[PDB]
Structure formats: C-alpha cells, structure tokens
RNA sequence: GGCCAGGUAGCUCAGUCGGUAUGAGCGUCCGCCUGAAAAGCGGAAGGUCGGCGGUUCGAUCCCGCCCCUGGCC
C-alpha cells in the first residue's frame, strides 16, 4: 500500500507467487495431517462400548 | 387475493333504495357482516379534520428559485375577496386547479394543528393538502387536485371530500364471488336486516338500451368455455372530458386510481354490479373479433406493455391484425383506450372460471377482473352491466350510445341462466342445526337469497339464482338458512360417543420415553423436517449412503434446504449449536418425530374418482407410493453432563452417557437391548455402539467423529444417539417372581481377557456357566496395570448366589463359580486371575 | 372436496414434493388422517388426530 | 416483478467503493490475584466480511448470476 503506484504491479506479483507457494504447502499438509488423524482415531481412542 | 374494499356511503345508498332511511353505525355493520359470514379485516374512518378546511382554486403560481427543490408561492382563491398566499412544494398542479386548503387554526389527522409559517423567505397562510394528509387516500407524492366542477372555492372541504365516510376492508371467501361488489354485499345486508332489496342490475334500475342490429362481427369457438359475450358502442366521446368527482372518489375509496372516463366507468360498474367490463378503442380494431384458444408459442402484449407467453389453454380475443385481450385477465395494448380515443366498443363477457384461474396464475396477473371471473360472474347481467356502462360513459364524456348490440349466448342461445333445481326436506336445516326453527323459516330465507321455492308436501324444490353457483346440494342450502338465522341460536349438547379403547401401546410408549428422558435431564425440542444445506457432506457420508436418498420439496421457504430429513440428528445438532452459541454450553436435547425415507423416485398416483370409496387395492397403492416414515427417538449432548456444585467440579459428557440414554429408552420401552462396537458415521469409530433388540438393529449411540465435529462447528466431545422406535416391538411382559427365603452367598471372580473382549461378553459367559443359582452379577473393577500384560485387562465381578429351596455351602457356590470360569475360558478366552 | 383450478385449492399454498405434478405433498392439515380412519374403521367414528 | 437498502467475530452490531476489519460491547484464553473463583489491572486468540464465478499482479470493497431478511406491491 505504501509503495509507489508504479511499483505495486511488479512487487505485488512477486508477493502473491510466494504467498501462494506457502498457502499451497499448508493446504496439503493440513489434509495429510487430517488424514492421519482420521486413520488413527479408531485405535487411539477406542473404548469398550 | 380475496380483498373487497368499499365505502359505507355507497353500500348504504344501494341498500337504501329498497329501505329508505336505512343507516347503521360502523360497529353494528361490522358485527352484522361477521355474523352472516363476511370477515371484516379493517374498518377505516376517513379524516377527521376540524377548523377551516376549504376548497380553493390556484389563481397564480410564482416559482421560488435558489433552493434544494422547486418551491411554489401560490395565490389561492378561497371564495372571498382576499386571495391567500400559500407555499407548496408539490408540482402536480397548475393555475386554475381546484385544491383543498387547510388554513391557520385547522386540525388535520392526527393532531396536526395548522398555523401561519415563515418558509422559504415567504409567509405561508396555510397549506395545500395531499390525500394522505387528509386521510382520504394514500397519495403523498403530490397534493390533491379535484376535477373541474367538483365544487366552488369556499366549499367546505370535509363535505366535498366526504370525510365522514368509513371504508370497509373485507376478505371474501371463494364460495361467495357475488359478494365482490356493492350489489352482492347490499343484498346480503337486506337479507340480514329483513329488508326489501332493489337490485342495482335489474331492468328497473338499468333500463335496456335499443337493440337495432349487430354492433361488431364476432366469431366464438364454444370449446373455450365462454358462456356469454356482448358488445355495444359509444361514439363521439370527448377526449378532454374527465370523470366527475363523485365517481373518481368512489374508485379511490375502493382502491382503484382514476385514469379516463371510459376506463373509470368500466371499473365503477365492475365494483357496482360485480361484472368486469372492458373498453376497446373501436377505431383500432381490424376486422372480425374472434374468441379462440391461443396456439403453441403464441404471445401477446397486454395493455401494461409487457409481452406474455401464452398457453394453448389460454382463451384470447383477437381481430384480423393482432390479439385484443387475454380473455378475463387483461386487455391488450393494440385496442387499449388512449387519450385521443373517440369511439369505444364496450366488452361484457363471461369466461370459464377454471380457464381464467389457470391463466392468471401462470402469468401472475391477479387482476380485478380475473379474481372475479375465477369465482364465477353472474351471466344474467352481462347486457345490464353493458348498458349501464354505455349510458354512463355517454353522459359523462359527451358521447352517444349506438343502438346496436351483439350478444352471443351460446349455440343454441341460452335465454335462461337458472341452475338445476334442488329438492330438500323442509325440516333438513332444523335437523342439522338442532334447532326447531319457526314455521316457514327455511322457505323465507331461501327466497331472500334469490331462489325460487315451491312446496311439494314436505319437500321443497329450490332453484338458486344465477349469481349463486355455489348452491348445488341441500347442505349448501342449509348453510344459507343457518347463517341468516344466526349460529348463536344453535344449542350446546354433547354427542353420544361410544366407549373408547384409550391410548394405543405405541402412543403410551412415546409418553413414557419422553417422561424418562426429561427426568434424566434431557430437554425436548421440536425438530425441523428440512435438512441443513450440505449436512451429509459435513458428515462425510458416502455418495451411496441411504440417508442421502431424500424426498425433496419443490417450493421450500429456503431454496438451499429442500430435502426432508432421513435422520433427526441434523435438527438436534442445529438446536444444540443455537444453545451453546448463546451461552448455554452444558446441554442435553432429545426429540421424537418421524423421518422421511423414500425407497424409489417420487412417483404419483392418478386421480381416483371421488364419487365412490377407493377400493382396498387403490388404498394400498396410494400407501405404497409414499416414502417410508417411521418414528425415531434421538438425543445429543455436550458440555458438562453433571453440573458443578458443593460436591465437586461436575463431570463432562462422555460416550457412556449416550449409551445410558439408550438404556433409559430401553427400560422405558420394557425391552432388552445389546450394544456392539460398530463403525458408522457421523459417530467416532472407536466410541460407537450399534444397538440391537434381539438380532434386529435399531440404531446407534456414542461420541461423534472429531472430524465431523470440526467441520460442523460442534462442541468437542459432542455425543449423540438415534433409535428407530418402529423397529422396537411393543412388549407386554408378565413377570412371576418367586422370592427365595433362603440366604445368599457372595463371591467375587477376577478374569483376565484380551483388551478387545467386551465386558458384557464376559458377563454373559459367566452367567451361562454359573446356571440358575446365579441371582446377580455386577462388574465393579477393570484393571490394566503392569502385572496384567499388554493388550489385556482384568475384570472383577461381584456374584450373588441363592438357591430357591435350600441354604448353600461355600462349595456349592464355588462349584457354580468354577463352571462360570470354564464357560468364560471357552467363550472369550478368559484366564482366572493369578 | 377441494375443487381443482379454483381459489378454494389454488389459494391453499402447499409444500409440493418434487418434481412438479407429482400429486405428493406435505400435508396442510391432519384431515387426511381423518379420511384414512373413515376408510379403515367401522362406523361410528370419534377420532382425534 | 422494480431500482434500492441489508447478510461482517461465539452473541448483538459499527466500519471500509483494491494490498492492516490498527473493529466495539459482551463470549473464549493467559498473567498478577484467590485455598479455588470473579471483579480489577495487564495482555492474547478467533472472521477465510452470504454462495459461485469474473475483472485485476492482488477483491469484504468493482461486474454477473444465485441464496437469505428489510423498505414495500
Ligand atoms: Mg355455502
Ligand atoms: Mg451474527
Ligand atoms: Mg481471568
Ligand atoms: Mg481481560
């Protein structure tokens, strides 16, 4: 926002590419960790019903 | 809709023709209308005003510039030698117009006192009033302009406006289409007050105009259901003429805006007599007028300028060039009366009520004409209403009535619109009412409403009038007599009901289940049958899960919630979130309702004739066409199950509390259940039990899956239960306990098993081996210490042995215990603790 | 005794079951339960629903 | 059916017509504190700004369609 108007297009494009790379890694890691939780829920928290 | 609005003054005038001097208070009129069956939605008195409210004439206008909005400094003639200077922000008037002036000292509704003001650098000596400021009508955009000749300057405003009037807003039931007019309502009041009625549609009140030849060539396809179609011209009307104030005022108080004399007259006569009327510019008609069904893909532009997609069941009026009207719904723009129209062809038609209903609902056009035609219009008054229109239009617009008339009345022509006669015993209304009416009551009341009545001994032959097509059966005639005599005369006596069987076992069980859950701390809710959007996606159910096979509503109140519930849990979870989100975090809810579980695609059954009873096969077919709808009981829990207090911090909800809910329901149903580990969304796969009665599955209980909890925004640890009550058979046990007077023997037994062995399986094996000497068994210890071994557990049961006919020795009890130990070794692999 | 294509039945706005013209709906009153009882039970009938 | 006005945190609501909602009151959490609490003082977390697309380097904000309430037929 504080950057000059002439520089916002170039810099903003590099920020979004880095931001999307981090967001991409987070999304799949969240899915991986959720899948592991769902796979381990039956045994780790089982009870005698 | 069913709304009928009319001013009392007009209703009184029509009643007073046959009952000179008739006049009742609005409170009594409202009660009389209610007593005979007409719902009064609102009674709206006009005004009131007080002080100097007078008619004025705008004699000059000075435009005041330099302000936000255009402002006018007006010199207004109020009938004396000193014109008043009045400031007004409205722009809908010109020099020479008649207006209504409230002078300083006047009081307008409500409590608005008028005084001289200093506005826009000028001195305003009063105000020019709008219809809304006078409580005459709703118009507030501009001020009220009276038509030329309505009064002279200086005339009393309240008198010219008739502000002592009262407007009645009625809701007419769909069996009384004849009451959507002053004619019908006045006739009803004449019946209620035993007055002589002069029919405003009769030849004495509307003397027939000459009939010297046809008015316009016409072809009618009788398959359209049109019963009558009449035409008469009025030539040489004055384009500059405007309807007189008495006519524009009555239209306004009935909710209709005045536009021009030709249209105003057709609307006025429609309100007066109940027969819709339409004015065509005859000079814009090209060739023969034809009444026919619309063809596929045909369209027409109605006089509102909107193009209408037509159906082959829509009835039209057409000429050689274009469509002239959607019959009984709205006229077309092609023949519409315009400001320069000078020759008019008036249309008085009777359309098929069902055809109009279908057409107007498809096109969303519930016009004043359509809602009358769909409730049936009296076909006998078509030419009367036509002649009434023609004579009134010619008078107020300076025209001439043409002595020509076209009047199609069917092939062959119908010269008598009498419905079929009805035979009824003279005492039938007395029997149904339980009242012995005075002699001749039934015949007098039925003649009052317009029927022809003849006596054949004890049997009446009743021919209803043409405006009462709702009178078809003796029961219809009974209602007429009873409502006019007043339902208050009907006594109150209890019927002779037979000895009943009371509540069924299922109805009784539902009460007992609800009492037990409530006493155990559960709060009942009423579950909504519409599923939250995408709830099964939140649960992660498979695409082929039977709960996804839902019945869907075509027109739900929320377009994203059309499906009906196959399970009660979504509605319970939604109520749990409502409670928790508002600060009530420790909650236990339950519900008892039906679910909707279809077994096929939505399949309908054709209409079965209602003149007979449906056969048992037709009944079973109607039942088989419906989705299965069994009764369920369900519950949800979150937060603390036991509250904190001076005993301690309380106890959070756990899966065992859901299992206990199952046992509460089971004890209330007097059935034995078993619980077995299961996997079944949305439950936690390690904390889920499937519930069985015998070998039949009846539901599930336990803790909800943590992923479902996260995606659904539920409290952590939320637990749930759902059982199918229809799958639980109604039981009626008859116990015969035999209390043994001999002492018992107490022993405990400790057995080591694999961790996956259910404790109930160990108890079952112990019971099977111990035999009949075992009176009671109770688990009181589950030990997984280090001396036991990994993936194993020690269980200790308290055993109570008692013989029915002797005292036992310790060896006798130990022998039964040892057989229970061997039973457990064989069935669950148990090892005696050591 | 509801007439077809009439305000006595058209005004009665009803939750109809999809698709259109399926002749299946959510009941607008418990009166159909009374109709079912008259078909199944011998007269006289004194029934609450 | 109209051009509008509205959907924003767990609740009730402010506020932004492009790159931080420096959001409020209450709700949740931490510290001091208390035997344990709460208030008080000092601090944090939490919204993907109604849904789906589009424009754009980038949209709570601009455009389209749709869902749900209000002004009102
Ligand atoms: Mg009747
Ligand atoms: Mg909110
Ligand atoms: Mg604190
Ligand atoms: Mg704080």
B242 and B156 in one domain? no
**Nearest Cα residue to B662 out of B645, B683, B644, B640:** B683
Q: Is residue B355 included in any domain, yes or no?
A: yes
Query: Among positive and negative, which fits the CA dihedral C35, C40, C41, C44?
Result: positive
Q: b/e per residue, B447-458, with b = 16+ CB within 10 A?
A: ebbbbebeeeee
* Paired tokens of B149: 């000749």
B653 and B553 in one domain? yes
Q: b/e per residue, B617-630, with b = 16+ CB within 10 A?
A: eeeeeeeeebbeee
What number of helices (H) and strands (E) belong to chain B?
Answer: 20, 40
Taking CA atoms, what residue in A is nearest to B678? A49
Please report residues of C whose CB lies closer than 8 A to that of B549: none
B635 and B523 in one domain? yes
Of B377, B408, B439, the domain-final residue: B408
Among candidates A38, A44, A49 on the partner chain, residue whose Cβ is nearest the Cβ of B707: A38
**B650 CB inside 7 Å of strand D:** no
* Paired tokens of B575: 């109520």
**Do B93 and B76 meet the contact criterion of CB atoms below 8 Å apart?**
no
Of B489, B517, B546, the domain-final residue: B489
**Do B332 and B326 meet the contact criterion of CB atoms below 8 Å apart?**
yes
B366 and B222 in one domain? yes
Nucleotide closest to A7 measured between CA and C1': D57
| Ligand nearest to the Cα of B582, by number | 2
The verdict on a CB contact (< 8 Å) between C23 and B358 is no
**Nearest Cα residue to B762 out of B829, B687, B814, B813:** B829
B650 and B533 in one domain? yes
D strand bases under 7 Å from protein CB: 1, 10-11, 19-20, 27, 57-58, 66-69, 73
Q: Is residue B185 included in any domain, yes or no?
A: no
DSSP state at residue C11: S
Distance CA B178, CA B171 (A): 13
Angle between helices B441-448 and B474-485 (to 10 degrees): 100
Helix (H) or strand (E) holding B768: helix B759-770
Distances (CA, A) of B693 to B68, B594, B669, B676, C25: 82, 20, 11, 11, 34
Q: Is residue B567 included in any domain, yes or no?
A: yes
Long-range contacts formed by B119-125: CB under 8 A, 24+ apart = B119/B87, B120/B64, B120/B67, B120/B71, B120/B73, B120/B87, B121/B64, B122/B64, B122/B73, B122/B85, B122/B87, B123/B85, B124/B85, B124/B86, B124/B87, B125/B84, B125/B85, B125/B86
CATH code of the domain covering residue B770: 3.30.70.380
* Paired tokens of B107: 């009081």
B144 and B229 in one domain? no
Strands B792-801 and B640-642: unpaired
The CA-based diameter of chain A, rounded to the nearest angstrom, is 67
Between CA A45 and C1' D15 the distance (Å) reads 46
Strands B299-301 and B651-652: unpaired
Distance CA B275, CA B348 (A): 8
User: Which residue matches tokens 């609800």?
Assistant: B514
**Do B621 and B592 meet the contact criterion of CB atoms below 8 Å apart?**
no
Q: Is residue B495 included in any domain, yes or no?
A: no
Distance CA B320, CA B298 (A): 15
Tallying the residues shown for chain A, one arrives at 49
**DSSP code string of B774-808:** EEEEEEEEEE--TTT-TTEEEEEEEEEE--SSSPP
Detail the DSSP E strand segments found in B565-695: 587-594, 631-638, 640-642, 651-652, 674-677, 683-693
Distance CA B541, CA B609 (A): 44
CATH code of the domain covering residue B160: 2.40.50.140
Among candidates B689, B706, B782 on the partner chain, residue whose Cβ is nearest the Cβ of A49: B689
Interface test with A, best of B679, B687, B719 (most A CBs within 10 A): B687
The alpha-carbon radius of gyration of chain B (Å, integer) is 41
B757 and B664 in one domain? no
CATH code of the domain covering residue B436: 3.30.56.10
**Do B603 and C19 meet the contact criterion of CB atoms below 8 Å apart?**
no
C5: left (phi over 0), alpha (psi -120 to 50) or beta: left
**DSSP code string of B567-587:** -SHHHHHHHHHHHHHTT--SE
B486: left (phi over 0), alpha (psi -120 to 50) or beta: left
| Ligand nearest to the Cα of B177, by number | 1
Nucleotide closest to A20 measured between CA and C1': D58
Count: domains in chain B: 5
**Do B232 and B277 meet the contact criterion of CB atoms below 8 Å apart?**
no
In Å, how far is B357's CA from the nearest CA of chain A? 57
**Do B400 and B233 meet the contact criterion of CB atoms below 8 Å apart?**
no
CATH code of the domain covering residue B626: 3.30.930.10
Residues 1-49 of chain A whose Cβ lies under 8 A from any Cβ of chain B: 34, 37-38, 41-49
Distances (CA, A) of B359 to B314, B331, B353, B355, B374: 6, 14, 10, 6, 10
Q: Which chains does chain A touch, 3 or more C-beta pairs < 8 A?
A: B
**Nearest Cα residue to B392 out of B214, B272, B215:** B272
Please report residues of B whose CB lies closer than 8 A to that of A41: 684-686, 705-707
| Ligand nearest to the Cα of B480, by number | 1
Which residues lie closer than 8 Å to B142 by C-beta, 6 or more apart? B90, B91, B92, B93, B130
Distance CA B628, CA B34 (A): 44
Other beta carbons less than 10 A from residue B735's beta carbon? 4
Distance CA B643, CA B650 (A): 5
B514 and B575 in one domain? yes
Distance CA B413, CA B379 (A): 13
Q: Is residue B211 included in any domain, yes or no?
A: no
Query: In the B/C pair of chains, how many CB contacts fall below 8 A?
Result: 65
Taking CA atoms, what residue in A is nearest to B704? A41
CA of residue B576 to ligand 3 center, whole Å: 27
Helix (H) or strand (E) holding B702: strand B696-704
Give SS3 for A16: helix
**For residue B340, how far is the Cα from the chain centroid?**
45
**Do B474 and B442 meet the contact criterion of CB atoms below 8 Å apart?**
no
**Do B269 and B385 meet the contact criterion of CB atoms below 8 Å apart?**
yes
**B583 CB inside 7 Å of strand D:** yes
B663 and B617 in one domain? yes
Interface test with B, best of C3, C4, C7, C26 (most B CBs within 10 A): C7
Detail the DSSP E strand segments found in B276-380: 278-281, 289-293, 299-301, 307-309, 315-318, 323-326, 330-331, 344-350
Distance CA B428, CA B442 (A): 9
Of B105, B134, B166, the domain-final residue: B166
| Residue B106: domain span | 53-166
**Do B587 and B580 meet the contact criterion of CB atoms below 8 Å apart?**
yes
**Do B568 and B527 meet the contact criterion of CB atoms below 8 Å apart?**
yes
Q: b/e per residue, B179-197, with b = 16+ CB within 10 A?
A: bbbbbbbbbbbbbbeebeb
B151 and B118 in one domain? yes
Neighbours of ion ligand 1 (CB under 5 A): B 476, 479
Q: Is residue B131 included in any domain, yes or no?
A: yes
**Nearest Cα residue to C23 out of B361, B359, B628, B625:** B625
Q: Resolution, in Å, please?
A: 2.0
Query: Among positive and negative, which fits the CA dihedral B93, B98, B103, B109?
Result: negative
CATH code of the domain covering residue B295: 3.50.40.10
Distance CA B145, CA B99 (A): 5
Q: Is residue B149 included in any domain, yes or no?
A: yes
CA of residue B256 to ligand 4 center, whole Å: 64
B92 and B61 in one domain? yes
* Paired tokens of B77: 């003639």
B589: left (phi over 0), alpha (psi -120 to 50) or beta: beta
Method: X-ray
Distance CA B348, CA B328 (A): 10
**A15 CB inside 7 Å of strand D:** yes
Taking CA atoms, what residue in A is nearest to B707? A38
Q: Is residue B494 included in any domain, yes or no?
A: no
**Nearest Cα residue to B529 out of B486, B565, B556:** B565
**Nearest Cα residue to B747 out of B808, B813, B811:** B813
The CA-based diameter of chain B, rounded to the nearest angstrom, is 132
Query: In the A/B pair of chains, how many CB contacts fall below 8 A?
Result: 36
**For residue B378, how far is the Cα from the chain centroid?**
29
Taking CA atoms, what residue in A is nearest to B782? A48
**Do B524 and B518 meet the contact criterion of CB atoms below 8 Å apart?**
yes
B442 and B355 in one domain? no
Query: Among positive and negative, which fits the CA dihedral B665, B670, B671, B675?
Result: positive
User: Which residue matches tokens 């009166």?
Assistant: C31
Distance CA C49, CA B346 (A): 54
**Do B406 and B413 meet the contact criterion of CB atoms below 8 Å apart?**
no
Please report residues of B whose CB lies closer than 8 A to that of A46: 686-687
Between CA B583 and C1' D14 the distance (Å) reads 23
Distance CA B277, CA B2 (A): 19
User: Which residue matches tokens 């099964």?
Assistant: B536
Helix (H) or strand (E) holding B825: helix B810-828
């Amino acid at each position: 926002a504080v950057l000059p108007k002439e520089q916002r297009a170039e810099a903003g494009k590099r920020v979004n590419a880095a931001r999307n790379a981090a967001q991409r890694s987070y999304d799949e890691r969240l899915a991986t960790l959720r899948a592991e939780r769902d796979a381990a829920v039956l045994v780790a928290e089982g009870i005698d019903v | 809709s069913n709304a009928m609005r009319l001013p009392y003054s007009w209703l009184r005038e029509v009643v007073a023709v046959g009952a000179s001097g008739w006049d009742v208070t609005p409170g009594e009129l409202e009660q009389t209308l209610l007593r005979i069956g007409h719902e009064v939605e609102e009674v709206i008195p006009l005004g009131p005003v007080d002080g100097p409210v007078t008619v004025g004439r705008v004699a000059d206008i000075e435009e005041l510039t330099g302000y936000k909005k255009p402002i006018r400094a007006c010199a207004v003639d109020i009938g004396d030698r000193q014109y008043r200077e009045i400031i007004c922000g409205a722009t809908n008037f010109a020099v020479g117009d008649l207006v209504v002036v409230a002078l300083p000292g006047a009081t307008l509704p409500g409590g608005f006192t008028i005084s001289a003001r200093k506005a826009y650098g000028r001195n305003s000596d009063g105000m020019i009033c709008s219809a809304a400021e006078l409580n005459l009508g709703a118009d507030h955009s501009g001020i009220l302009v009276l038509p030329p000749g309505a009064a002279e300057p200086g005339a009393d405003g309240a008198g010219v406006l008739g502000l002592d009037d009262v407007v009645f807003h009625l809701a007419i039931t769909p069996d009384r289409g004849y009451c959507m007019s002053v004619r019908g309502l006045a006739r009803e009041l004449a019946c209620a007050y035993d007055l002589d009625f002069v029919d405003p549609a009769s030849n004495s009140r509307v003397p027939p105009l000459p009939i010297e030849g046809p008015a316009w060539p016409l072809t009618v396809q009788p398959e359209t259901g049109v019963r009558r179609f009449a035409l008469r011209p009025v030539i040489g009307i004055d384009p500059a003429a405007v309807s007189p104030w008495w006519l524009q005022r009555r239209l306004l108080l009935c909710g209709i805006r005045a536009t021009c004399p030709a249209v105003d007259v057709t609307n006025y006569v429609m309100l007066e007599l109940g027969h819709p009327m339409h004015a065509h510019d005859r000079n814009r008609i090209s060739g023969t007028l034809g009444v026919r069904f619309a063809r596929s893909g045909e369209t027409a532009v109605t006089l509102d300028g909107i193009e209408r997609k037509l159906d082959t069941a829509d009835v039209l009026i057409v000429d050689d060039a274009a469509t002239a009207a959607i019959g009984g719904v709205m006229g077309a723009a092609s023949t519409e009366v315009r400001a320069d129209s000078t020759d008019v062809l008036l249309e008085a038609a009777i359309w098929d009520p069902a055809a109009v209903s279908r057409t107007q609902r498809r096109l969303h056009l519930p016009s004043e004409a359509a809602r009358r035609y769909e409730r049936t219009v009296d076909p006998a008054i078509s030419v009367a209403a036509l002649d009434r229109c023609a004579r009134l239009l010619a008078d107020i617009a300076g025209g001439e009535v043409s002595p020509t008339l076209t009047d199609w009345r069917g092939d062959p022509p119908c010269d008598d619109w009498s419905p079929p006669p009805i035979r009824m015993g003279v005492d039938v209304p007395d029997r149904i009412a339980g009242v012995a009416y005075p002699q001749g009551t039934t015949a007098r009341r039925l003649a009052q409403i317009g029927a022809v009545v003849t006596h054949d001994g004890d049997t009446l032959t009743v021919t209803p009038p043409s405006w009462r097509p709702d009178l078809r059966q003796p029961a219809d005639l009974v209602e007429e007599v009873l409502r006019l005599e007043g339902l208050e005369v009907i006594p109150s006596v209890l019927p002779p009901a037979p000895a009943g069987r009371g509540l069924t076992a299922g109805q009784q069980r539902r009460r007992t289940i609800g009492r037990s859950l409530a006493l155990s701390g559960y709060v009942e809710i009423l579950p909504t049958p519409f599923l939250p959007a995408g709830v099964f996606d939140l649960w992660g159910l498979e695409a082929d899960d039977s709960r996804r096979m839902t019945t869907r509503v075509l027109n739900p109140l929320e377009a994203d919630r059309p499906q009906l519930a196959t399970t009660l849990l979504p509605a319970l979870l939604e109520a749990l979130v409502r409670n928790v989100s508002r600060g009530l975090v420790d909650v236990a809810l339950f519900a008892i309702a039906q679910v909707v579980q279809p077994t096929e695609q939505t399949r309908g059954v054709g209409l079965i004739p209602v003149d007979r009873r449906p056969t048992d096969d037709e009944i079973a077919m109607l039942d088989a066409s419906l989705p299965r709808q069994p009764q369920h009981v369900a519950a949800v829990l979150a937060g603390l199950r036991e509250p904190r207090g001076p005993w301690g911090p309380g106890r959070p909800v756990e899966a065992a509390d859901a299992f206990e809910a199952v046992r509460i329901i089971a004890r209330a149903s007097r059935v034995d259940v078993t619980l077995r580990p299961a996997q079944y969304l949305p439950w936690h796969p390690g904390r889920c039990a499937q519930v069985f009665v015998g070998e039949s599955s009846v539901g599930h209980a336990g803790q909800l899956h943590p992923a479902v909890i996260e995606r659904s925004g539920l409290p952590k640890g939320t637990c749930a239960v759902e059982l199918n009550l229809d799958a639980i058979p109604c039981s009626a046990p008859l116990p015969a306990p035999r209390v043994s007077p001999y002492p018992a023997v107490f022993q405990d037994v400790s057995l080591v098993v694999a961790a996956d062995i259910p404790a109930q399986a160990v108890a079952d094996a112990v019971r099977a081996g111990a035999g009949d000497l075992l009176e009671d068994i109770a688990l009181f210890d589950v030990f997984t210490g280090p001396q036991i071994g990994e993936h194993r557990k020690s269980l200790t049961f308290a055993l109570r042995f008692r013989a029915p006919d002797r005292t036992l020795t310790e060896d006798d009890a130990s022998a039964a215990r040892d057989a229970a130990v061997q039973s457990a070794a064989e069935r669950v692999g148990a090892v005696l603790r050591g | 005794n509801f007439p077809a294509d009439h305000p006595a039945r058209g005004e009665q706005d009803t939750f109809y079951i999809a698709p259109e013209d399926s002749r299946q709906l959510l009941r607008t009153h418990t009166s159909p339960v009374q109709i079912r009882t008259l078909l199944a039970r011998e007269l006289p009938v004194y029934i609450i629903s």
